[PDB]
Design a protein around this ligand. Structure first.
Ligand SMILES: NCc1c[nH]c2nc(N)[nH]c(=O)c12
Ligand SMILES: NCc1c[nH]c2nc(N)[nH]c(=O)c12
Ligand SMILES: [Zn+2]
Ligand SMILES: [Zn+2]
Lengths: 363, 363
């Protein structure tokens, strides 16, 4: 089992499919990562997360540093042992959540309590993270060229510090991997600058940051169109915070290999279930006596046993079992979507799938 | 598979152990019944409920009639299919919950919307219930002899109507069982009257109602001491709403065969975990870094994988996984307790177990 090895087994247009091999397991790409804020994928046992098909989950550095604390988790044995997930875990750097949830921004780091590239990397280390994200700053939207160019440059300076900070910890540099994050809002030249700086520094994977921050899909794809190709080709492409079904498909078409989103998890607890015929709000009075499963084709355990009527009942009653079932279904649905995407690329029919998917999903 | 057959395989003092065979499954007695208010045992999949060892769960008639509705559940296929539990389900009559949650009391029934012995039995029928409880009135505490004697008499009149109402539905009388409920507060003569009236009417099992309503353990045992022996011996004895660990033990000593309680479920979601060394509030700051399981001997899946520190973290953070794990552990603990009780009675050492249990549980 190598530390980190990405191989592409099939392509079609900019879309790719393959695997990322790591010490804790193999990750099939394009991949969807369930989000594990607070050392738990909301409402699911790790085994249930694994059963839906997930090969890797995302853990948040911001939230865990506060509660229960990095050193503490490290003392208990690391995040994997703490939550009971023994497969790869990717941990965000915290830059995104800090400037979103709690601010004194300088060059050393950020204050809300100082969080610096150096500290971020150590935190991800104590957690026992498999894929460390470089500490950065997600530029808000909109953002004048100047602003977008300031954040980006500072980010790129943090990228270098993140890299060195990572390479100094012998046991970390040898067991985990490091991804750099490109920034630069919706500006072509800024994206390019960022890409070059990152490639110059060297990273195991490259994420596209600062998107899906409010610019809408059209814009996002447009930006993705020139940005993704800037990143090296023989390395994984990670689109951060993107997860609407339709978004994943388009991003994969444009070359993205990894996704992470709370939509599946959060949407579920609230009453939205994803189906191949588009989403549905199970709370609707029209499912009250519907004996059909959430989705007619879904292979998840929830769609094999319970009806929409039952789940409708659970959700309107505010029962925990309701959130459990909805969430298992949504994540399972997302993983089936990723499976259909990998398979279609391996067969050279991704283009048609993408087309058949949108027709039905939006019919 | 018979409709309802109770057999005692071992005894010691007033304690008994045996099985209750029904069409949907065998029930090992003394038995503990997880409470399923709203067609779901809070935070658990039916399989997980079964995994803890439960042979039967209790469903509430009051709550289900309101939401989602009896006829509706019957239309979807019955409670078993609706929630995904194919084993026996005992359904309370609703008398208890009506005069507790929402009142116009007469002889025909109760108004809060009329709920009558006749309607109660039909509701339990539409639900597809295996053990139907007679519709009754749980006398509040305290209660002057006169009051306690009024409720009781009316209850006993309802017992008769419940019985006939039950025997008229050919397919119900042939597949389900009917329990009568003794009432009479803490008064010996009233309890006796009730017992005779019930035995005169004839029932498949007898429950002891109106206890654990605020009289405290000492009083409850005292009342149980003369009340339990009044009920027939070759039939199951059901103590309603009793579940504190120590309470179950004492009641079994006094002849009780069946228990139902929310303590396990509700207590869990709130932060209390049962251990053989007494309960603990996992929220306490002293478990923050405790790598030991909830209980050192518990065989449940939760105690096999996660630590008190992790669960401590989940509960303080208000995470759903926290309630899931705590609840699975508590119900599993209750079932292990029942297993230890059945085994000790089968070996003639229940007395010593009861003694060893209290010494440690309260040390
Ligand atoms: N929507 C952009 C985004 C999501 N998550 C992120 N995490 C980091 N570190 N940076 C980013 O720009 C983002
Ligand atoms: N604590 C007494 C009790 C619990 N559940 C009950 N259900 C019914 N029908 N009657 C009762 O008296 C009780
Ligand atoms: Zn499903
Ligand atoms: Zn346990």
């Amino acid at each position: 089992r190598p530390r980190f090895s990405f191989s592409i087994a099939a392509r079609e247009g900019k879309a790719r499919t393959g695997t990322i091999e790591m010490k804790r397991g193999v990750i099939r790409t394009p991949a969807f990562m369930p989000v594990g804020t607070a050392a738990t994928v909301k409402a699911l046992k790790p085994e249930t997360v694994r059963a839906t098909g997930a090969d890797i989950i995302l853990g948040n550095t911001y939230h865990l540093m506060l509660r229960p604390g990095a050193e503490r988790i490290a003392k208990l044995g690391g995040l994997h042992s703490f939550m009971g997930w023994d497969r790869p875990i990717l941990t965000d750097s915290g830059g995104y959540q800090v400037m979103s949830l709690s601010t004194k921004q300088s060059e050393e780091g950020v204050t809300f309590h100082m969080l610096s590239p150096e500290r971020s990397i150590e935190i991800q280390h104590l957690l026992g993270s498999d894929i460390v994200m470089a500490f950065d700053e997600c530029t808000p939207y909109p953002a004048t060229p100047s602003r977008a160019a300031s954040s980006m440059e500072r980010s790129m300076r943090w990228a270098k510090r993140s890299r060195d900070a990572f390479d100094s910890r012998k046991e970390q540099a040898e067991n985990a991997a490091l991804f750099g994050i490109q920034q630069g809002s919706v500006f072509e030249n800024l994206r390019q600058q960022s890409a070059d700086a990152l490639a110059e520094i060297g990273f195991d994977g490259y994420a596209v940051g600062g998107l899906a921050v409010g610019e809408g899909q059209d814009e996002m794809f447009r930006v993705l169109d020139f940005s993704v190709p800037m990143l090296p080709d023989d390395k994984p492409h990670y689109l951060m915070g993107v997860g609407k079904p339709d978004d994943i498909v388009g991003a994969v078409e444009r070359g993205i290999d990894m996704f992470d989103c709370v939509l599946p998890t959060r949407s579920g607890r609230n009453g939205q279930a994803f189906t191949w015929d588009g989403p549905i709000n199970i709370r609707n009075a029209r499912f009250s006596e519907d004996l059909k499963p959430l989705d007619s084709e879904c292979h998840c355990a929830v769609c094999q046993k319970w009806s929409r009527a039952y789940i409708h009942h659970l959700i309107r009653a505010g029962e925990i079992l309701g959130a459990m079932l909805m969430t298992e279904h949504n994540i399972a649905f997302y993983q089936q979507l990723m499976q259909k995407i990998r398979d279609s690329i391996s067969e050279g029919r991704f283009s048609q799938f993408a087309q058949d998917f949108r027709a039905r999903y939006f019919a």
